[PDB]
């Protein structure tokens, strides 16, 4: 796999890409990676839903730390 790590959407989003989902400011879905790469941006993965789903949106909306 590589990484993941529990996140809380922030806000509420709604998906349009291919690994996109909607979601709701409250919820909790494991993020896929992280904004090292990319700069405000956060994911969405759910494992407590079978069959799991994955997101993708920016840290506004996802729980982040920032260094």
């Known amino acids: 796999s590589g990484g ?13 890409h291919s690994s996109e989902l909607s979601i709701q400011v409250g919820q ?5 990676e992280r904004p090292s790469e990319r700069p405000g941006w956060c994911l969405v993965r759910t494992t407590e839903r079978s069959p799991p789903q994955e ?10 730390s920032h260094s």
């Open 4 to 16: 993941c790590e529990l996140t809380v959407v922030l806000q509420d989003f709604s998906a349009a």
């Open 55 to 64: 997101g993708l949106v920016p840290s506004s909306t996802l729980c982040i």
């Open 28 to 32: 909790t879905v494991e993020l896929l």
